[PDB]
Structure 1
Amino acid sequence: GSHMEKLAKNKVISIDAGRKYFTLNQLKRIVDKASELGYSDVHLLLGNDGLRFLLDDMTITANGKTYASDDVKKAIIEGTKAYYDDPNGTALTQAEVTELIEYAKSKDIGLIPAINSPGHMDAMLVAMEKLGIKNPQAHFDKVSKTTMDLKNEEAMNFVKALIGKYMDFFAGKTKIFNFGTDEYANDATSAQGWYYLKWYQLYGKFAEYANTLAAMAKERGLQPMAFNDGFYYEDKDDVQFDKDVLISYWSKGWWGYNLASPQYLASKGYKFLNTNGDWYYILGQKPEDGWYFLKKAIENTGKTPFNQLASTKYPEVDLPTVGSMLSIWADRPSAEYKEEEIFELMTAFADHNKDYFRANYNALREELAKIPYSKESLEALDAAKTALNYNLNRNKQAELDTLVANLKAA
């Protein structure tokens, strides 16, 4: 599309701060790097196996009773340490996420939070047991460590209330809320979660829960987002899903993980955030470890087109996306986070797609903040400010720099 259409697309960096602790300063630096490279958003997983975000008030009402704030905080901390007791820290505070959002906003960077369920919720499962909610776990080939039992009302009522509170905090602070839903019970079904749901006639109950979280998002003025996995599994539609969800599409799946195609979901009216698995990097991952190692991720930022949805060949298949997301995962969270690796990956994606990414506007904001005299000198500042172009992409840094230089002189 046009110059305007390209720059209006979302350019997103995702950070798995669910499995692994990131300090507020580490995340601010990511925001900084995103702002310079011309991204529009930071996607931040806060619940993803671990749950590394606590609000000031964590009081929950569900199941006819209340769970007091201190007990919820204690339970969640215990759940999170039980998944991984990160030496670097456990959870971000309300004050810290509030500051990250404000800080990002000052650099025209949005934040997109993710709180995962009913899969990738190890911490919430143990937390619920510490609060007296027995057997919240899905149980298939074994008792799952990651996933909630969809028939357990007590657990479901609790989790929904908890996600409601988080959504309450983000309401009016962010546009988007990602409720996840990927890889249901992968640990207990050898990554055949959806097949197991259908087998047990529980997929309809998955949709009921997915639709609930979508509705919850919308009634709090948040645009819902979820991963594509659970939606219209195997291109079948006898179970219906909320059409308003923004789909974070990462893959059509693997042998016998028979996900809906992007073609099929588009046909149902869905819009996509292009979250191609091609751009995945797992901290510390090398060729010998499996998929999603650094060298290949870096290669793919050039090799896979910006608009190419996974399992499709662009432009032969050309489906509406709202933008694209590159993803940093923490599967082994004891692995050392090396900022420079993430920065190289981010830079490569921006460099290969200069039409989509903004120019770096940081020097401009620094020169503007220096403003507080004759009519001649004030006239000089008048025109130099008028000459500023806020619409420049990454191809036009030199051009922006000249405009800033002229402002400095004035």
Structure 2
Amino acid sequence: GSHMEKLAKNKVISIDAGRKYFTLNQLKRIVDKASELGYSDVHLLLGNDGLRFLLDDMTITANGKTYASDDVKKAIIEGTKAYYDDPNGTALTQAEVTELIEYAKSKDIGLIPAINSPGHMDAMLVAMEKLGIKNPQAHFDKVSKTTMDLKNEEAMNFVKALIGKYMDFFAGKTKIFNFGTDQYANDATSAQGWYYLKWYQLYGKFAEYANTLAAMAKERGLQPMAFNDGFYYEDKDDVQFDKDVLISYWSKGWWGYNLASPQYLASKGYKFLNTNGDWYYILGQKPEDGGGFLKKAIENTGKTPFNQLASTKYPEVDLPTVGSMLSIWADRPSAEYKEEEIFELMTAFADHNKDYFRANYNALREELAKIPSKESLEALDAAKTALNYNLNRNKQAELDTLVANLKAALQ
């Protein structure tokens, strides 16, 4: 019950770089601002509708045949462009994402990648078509454009191998890997995908796929993360799920979309990354549209407590969370990304929870990088011993004089 508990928790900013393209430098500045504000990780969706990340070797081995690296790359580029041909760019390179991870590591910032499936995979579906894999899309009220058919082995096998190749990359580089599994065939079932899975006795098939993805993460030394949607839908435990999955809990849903309660998932032994929907911001969203516009997300950043999970009340309901995630989405990826908006929402969330967030260590690290008579060395050694790396956002002044004493000793 000491000091450490609050600071040990995760403070995450989520960027939807799957739907919309973000430049390496844009993400670097988000990472820098995250480090400055006191965040711990940057959650970066790279596969979300579009697939905006290419490895150097994209060779895939599936269905007793292989798909050549250059053939895979072109098909993915075409898929992402088919979803949305972003004039700012198509997909991040291996070298760019690698530099982002090392840059973030230098600022005590984790990177949490997300490659979504079996929903939110418009780019992958079309890529598979271009790769010869016929009809990968789910089929209900109409043929889906976002979701994979669970009965199609050819598509399932490829996608598993594809996510596996990404998982091979992020292994040893990042602690967590998010595979999503949210909003199954929402476009093809009027946002009732889990009800449709139940109906056609395919919900067990989804579990098998999700559990496979969790094992794939674990055996590669990655903590599996997924969204809550498809985990124990409607509090039924007829179909079981992997318990080692870090659940990013965003909502309990709405009418006809009966997601499991946080209370039920906690009773199954799950830990939560509090990804409360209240803190959502969709780029370009205005107050007139309702939902997650900027003013509401800033307003709710103080309204909705740090530990409070969606559909629950804190502290009346107090469930185990590893930390909280604030999310920026790009539902309409053509909307202008304005850095100032995200920075304001990020700042607000940190300012209301100064006990959870770190202090600003950018000044300290610059002054420690300037370090190359024994009496003058006595002072330089003394200021170094007096440094405190454990400060939170409430004590910026406390840290400001400690770094000032280091600057004075160095001269």
TM-score normalised to structure 2 length: 0.99
Separation (CA, whole Å) in 2 of partners of 1:47 and 1:371? 42
Give the C-alpha shift of residue 19 in structure 1.
Answer: 0.1
Separation (CA, whole Å) in 1 of partners of 2:30 and 2:101? 12
1:207 and 1:239 in contact (8 A); partners too: yes
Map of 2:75 onto structure 1: 75
Map of 2:145 onto structure 1: 145
Listed as ranges, the gaps of 5+ residues in structure 1 are none
Separation (CA, whole Å) in 1 of partners of 2:171 and 2:365? 28
Q: What CA deviation, in whole Å up to 9, does each residue of 1:348-396 have, x standing for no partner?
A: 0000000000000000000000011x11100000110000000000000
Give the C-alpha shift of residue 134 in structure 1.
Answer: 0.5
Give the C-alpha shift of residue 14 in structure 1.
Answer: 0.1
Q: What CA deviation, in whole Å up to 9, does each residue of 1:198-237 have, x standing for no partner?
A: 0000000000000000000000000000000000000000
Q: What CA deviation, in whole Å up to 9, does each residue of 1:47-79 have, x standing for no partner?
A: 000000000000000000000000000000000
Q: What CA deviation, in whole Å up to 9, does each residue of 1:262-288 have, x standing for no partner?
A: 000000000000000000000000122
Separation (CA, whole Å) in 2 of partners of 1:174 and 1:371? 30
Give the C-alpha shift of residue 310 in structure 1.
Answer: 0.3
Helix, strand or coil for the counterpart of 1:248? Answer: strand
Q: What CA deviation, in whole Å up to 9, does each residue of 1:16-42 have, x standing for no partner?
A: 000000000000000000000000000
1:10 and 1:322 in contact (8 A); partners too: yes
Identity across matched positions, percent: 99
Separation (CA, whole Å) in 2 of partners of 1:113 and 1:349? 22
1:355 and 1:393 in contact (8 A); partners too: yes
* RMSD across aligned positions (CA): 0.5
Separation (CA, whole Å) in 1 of partners of 2:290 and 2:296? 11
Separation (CA, whole Å) in 2 of partners of 1:266 and 1:2? 24
Separation (CA, whole Å) in 1 of partners of 2:134 and 2:68? 18
Give the C-alpha shift of residue 318 in structure 1.
Answer: 0.1
Separation (CA, whole Å) in 2 of partners of 1:58 and 1:242? 29
Separation (CA, whole Å) in 1 of partners of 2:173 and 2:325? 20
Give the C-alpha shift of residue 150 in structure 1.
Answer: 0.2
Map of 2:168 onto structure 1: 168
Give the C-alpha shift of residue 126 in structure 1.
Answer: 0.1
TM-score normalised to structure 1 length: 0.99
Structure 1: 4+ residue segments shifted above 2 A: none
Separation (CA, whole Å) in 1 of partners of 2:83 and 2:387? 50
Separation (CA, whole Å) in 2 of partners of 1:379 and 1:32? 33
Give the C-alpha shift of residue 289 in structure 1.
Answer: 2.0
Give the C-alpha shift of residue 290 in structure 1.
Answer: 2.8
Give the C-alpha shift of residue 3 in structure 1.
Answer: 2.1
Map of 1:49 onto structure 2: 49
Q: Does 1:386 align with 2:385?
A: yes
Helix, strand or coil for the counterpart of 1:119? Answer: coil
Q: What CA deviation, in whole Å up to 9, does each residue of 1:174-193 have, x standing for no partner?
A: 00000000000000000000
Give the C-alpha shift of residue 145 in structure 1.
Answer: 0.4
Separation (CA, whole Å) in 2 of partners of 1:405 and 1:274? 37
Map of 1:239 onto structure 2: 239
Per mean C-alpha deviation after superposition, the further-off stretch among 285-294 and 357-366 is: 285-294
Give the C-alpha shift of residue 2 in structure 1.
Answer: 3.4
Helix, strand or coil for the counterpart of 1:247? Answer: strand
Map of 1:279 onto structure 2: 279
Map of 1:216 onto structure 2: 216
Q: What CA deviation, in whole Å up to 9, does each residue of 1:103-141 have, x standing for no partner?
A: 000000000000000000000000000000010000000
Helix, strand or coil for the counterpart of 1:87? Answer: coil
Map of 1:266 onto structure 2: 266
Q: What CA deviation, in whole Å up to 9, does each residue of 1:325-363 have, x standing for no partner?
A: 000000000000000000000000000000000000000
Listed as ranges, the gaps of 5+ residues in structure 2 are none
1:232 and 1:241 in contact (8 A); partners too: yes
1:12 and 1:40 in contact (8 A); partners too: yes
1:38 and 1:360 in contact (8 A); partners too: yes
Separation (CA, whole Å) in 2 of partners of 1:312 and 1:15? 25
Separation (CA, whole Å) in 2 of partners of 1:178 and 1:363? 32
Separation (CA, whole Å) in 1 of partners of 2:321 and 2:142? 38
Helix, strand or coil for the counterpart of 2:398? Answer: helix
Separation (CA, whole Å) in 2 of partners of 1:382 and 1:86? 52
Separation (CA, whole Å) in 2 of partners of 1:140 and 1:14? 31
Separation (CA, whole Å) in 1 of partners of 2:180 and 2:273? 13
1:3 and 1:355 in contact (8 A); partners too: no
Separation (CA, whole Å) in 2 of partners of 1:301 and 1:284? 19
Separation (CA, whole Å) in 1 of partners of 2:87 and 2:102? 27
Separation (CA, whole Å) in 1 of partners of 2:290 and 2:360? 35
